[PDB]
């Protein structure tokens, strides 16, 4: 089997991407944030505290003839940005882009943190990291991909995120028309539960490539590119007037600037992030200070190849017995 679904930016900055997911019978379609940095499929629901729902579409398990309470199971998750959610668990039929999994754990939120409530466009998350990170207790549950894998034509999924435009998540096949050149594959460590890999270096604009190992995670659920402070300083030094602002929470730059590209290495291959992809717009409405899309990972404890980086590539998440990542230009 295969599946293919379009993923759509939630706003004009590409802060996140939403993908429609069919849950239950008859289907209830929710728009979920596909997150290769976590491993829970959780949704706003009829059980979510009413004051914490503000415009989201909810899953109502009592209206699904295939829903079953997973007795005794609870979940609770905290994300790298300080947000969180928790609740109980149903199993139900879940379909993405025509690919169907029966008995998928659907984690129904009883509580969500304010950042989720305040974002009416995201109805929940669909985790695509390794199932060892799933938070369901006392019986850990499998991700949608883990449940589907054995049925897929090939045990892979691909992320093709758009810049200020829709893109595609495919399951079970490589669309050879979706990228240019060849796909370069690179080793993955699953020891922390992530799609963790080592970039071979970077360049700023037309500058020379610096060969240096940068361990990080491929994380579709993180907006920005978080890299070591040395690398980030080297980038922003090429933007007149850019500076790190402790009060804003990162590097800012004059909105009048033209940003240089940023290149990262995948083996001997190179992925070029155009400068425009690094512009996240005014820090507040009407400001001439703009927020940068490359930020320091100091204090986060891991480097993160978030959407800023991934949207510049066609990315293969190869879930074979020994997982690997692939990157191609597009």
């Amino acid at each position: 089997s295969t599946g293919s679904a379009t993923t759509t930016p939630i706003d004009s900055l590409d802060d996140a991407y939403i993908t429609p997911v069919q849950i239950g019978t008859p289907a209830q379609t929710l728009n979920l944030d596909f997150d290769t940095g976590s491993s829970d499929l959780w949704v706003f629901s009829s059980e979510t505290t009413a004051s914490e729902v503000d415009g989201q579409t909810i899953y109502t398990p009592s209206k699904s003839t295939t829903a079953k309470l997973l007795s005794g199971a609870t979940w609770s998750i905290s994300y790298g940005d300080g947000s969180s959610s928790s609740g109980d668990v149903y199993t139900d039929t879940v379909s993405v882009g025509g690919l169907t999994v029966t008995g998928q754990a659907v984690e129904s939120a009883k509580k969500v943190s304010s950042s989720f409530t305040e974002d009416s466009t995201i109805d929940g998350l669909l985790g695509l990291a390794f199932s060892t990170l799933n938070t369901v207790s006392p019986t850990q549950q499998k991700t949608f991909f883990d449940n589907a894998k054995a049925s897929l034509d090939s045990p892979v999924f691909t992320a093709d995120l758009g810049y200020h435009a829709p893109g595609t998540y495919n399951f079970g096949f490589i669309d050879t028309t979706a990228y240019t050149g060849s796909i370069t594959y690179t080793a993955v460590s699953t020891k922390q539960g992530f799609w963790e890999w080592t970039s071979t270096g970077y360049a700023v604009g037309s500058g020379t490539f610096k060969s240096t190992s940068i361990d990080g995670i491929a994380d579709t659920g993180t907006t920005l590119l978080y890299l070591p402070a040395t690398v980030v300083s080297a980038y922003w030094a090429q933007v007149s007037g850019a500076k790190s602002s402790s009060s804003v929470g990162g590097y800012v730059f004059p909105c009048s600037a033209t940003l240089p590209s940023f290149t990262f290495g995948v083996g001997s291959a190179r992925i070029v992030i155009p400068g425009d992809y690094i512009d996240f717009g005014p820090i507040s409405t009407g400001s001439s200070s703009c927020f940068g899309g490359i930020q320091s990972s100091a204090g986060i404890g891991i480097n993160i190849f978030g959407d800023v980086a991934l949207k510049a590539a066609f990315v293969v998440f190869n879930g074979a017995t020994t997982p690997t990542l692939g990157f191609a230009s597009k």
Side-chain angles (χ1 to χ4, degrees), residues 1-62 64-67 69-109 112-141 143-148 150-190 192-242 244-330:
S1 62
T2 63
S4 179
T6 298
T7 193
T8 300
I10 64 167
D11 64 23
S12 65
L13 298 176
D14 298 344
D15 281 318
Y17 298 78
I18 49 173
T19 309
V21 178
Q22 282 71 50
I23 310 177
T25 309
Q28 300 178 39
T29 298
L30 276 64
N31 297 328
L32 305 188
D33 185 351
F34 282 24
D35 181 12
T36 63
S38 68
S39 307
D40 288 49
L41 193 176
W42 74 260
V43 297
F44 279 79
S45 75
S46 57
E47 303 180 328
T48 309
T49 298
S51 63
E52 297 178 355
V53 184
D54 186 5
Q56 295 82 10
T57 295
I58 63 168
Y59 170 59
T60 302
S62 65
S64 174
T65 59
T66 43
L69 181 71
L70 186 62
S71 180
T74 60
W75 62 280
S76 181
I77 192 163
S78 302
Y79 295 101
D81 62 352
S83 67
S84 62
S85 54
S86 62
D88 58 14
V89 186
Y90 295 81
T91 56
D92 209 341
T93 301
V94 172
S95 299
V96 177
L99 170 65
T100 300
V101 168
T102 58
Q104 175 63 46
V106 177
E107 301 173 34
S108 165
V112 304
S113 65
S114 59
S115 67
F116 290 112
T117 300
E118 291 162 3
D119 181 5
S120 68
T121 71
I122 291 174
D123 302 324
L125 268 64
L126 189 150
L128 292 169
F130 292 87
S131 292
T132 54
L133 295 182
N134 177 266
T135 77
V136 177
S137 180
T139 306
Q140 187 171 66
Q141 301 294 304
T143 70
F144 175 80
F145 178 56
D146 224 333
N147 281 322
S151 302
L152 294 177
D153 291 355
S154 179
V156 305
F157 68 90
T158 64
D160 180 8
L161 301 180
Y163 166 66
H164 293 180
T168 305
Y169 282 102
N170 290 331
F171 292 83
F173 71 106
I174 307 301
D175 178 359
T176 62
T177 74
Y179 57 87
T180 63
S182 52
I183 307 177
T184 295
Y185 290 86
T186 196
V188 165
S189 174
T190 65
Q192 297 183 50
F194 301 123
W195 294 92
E196 188 173 1
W197 65 289
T198 302
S199 172
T200 50
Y202 69 98
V204 175
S206 58
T208 61
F209 187 83
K210 175 71 169 181
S211 293
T212 183
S213 293
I214 304 170
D215 296 340
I217 65 168
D219 185 2
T220 58
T222 291
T223 312
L224 305 186
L225 174 54
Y226 294 89
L227 292 173
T230 47
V231 178
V232 175
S233 180
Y235 178 80
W236 290 108
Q238 299 306 311
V239 180
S240 285
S244 183
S245 167
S246 57
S247 60
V248 175
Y251 280 87
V252 298
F253 66 94
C255 295
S256 59
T258 300
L259 296 180
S261 64
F262 184 88
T263 299
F264 63 95
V266 182
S268 58
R270 306 289 180 253
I271 300 294
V272 180
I273 305 170
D276 288 352
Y277 290 26
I278 299 160
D279 181 1
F280 280 75
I283 60 171
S284 294
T285 301
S287 179
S288 72
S289 184
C290 274
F291 197 67
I294 296 178
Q295 297 293 346
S296 178
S297 65
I300 309 181
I302 198 159
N303 300 305
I304 306 174
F305 293 87
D307 297 335
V308 164
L310 303 182
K311 77 177 72 178
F314 177 88
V315 187
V316 180
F317 294 80
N318 169 28
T321 301
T322 298
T324 65
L325 281 164
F327 292 82
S329 294
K330 64 187 184 190

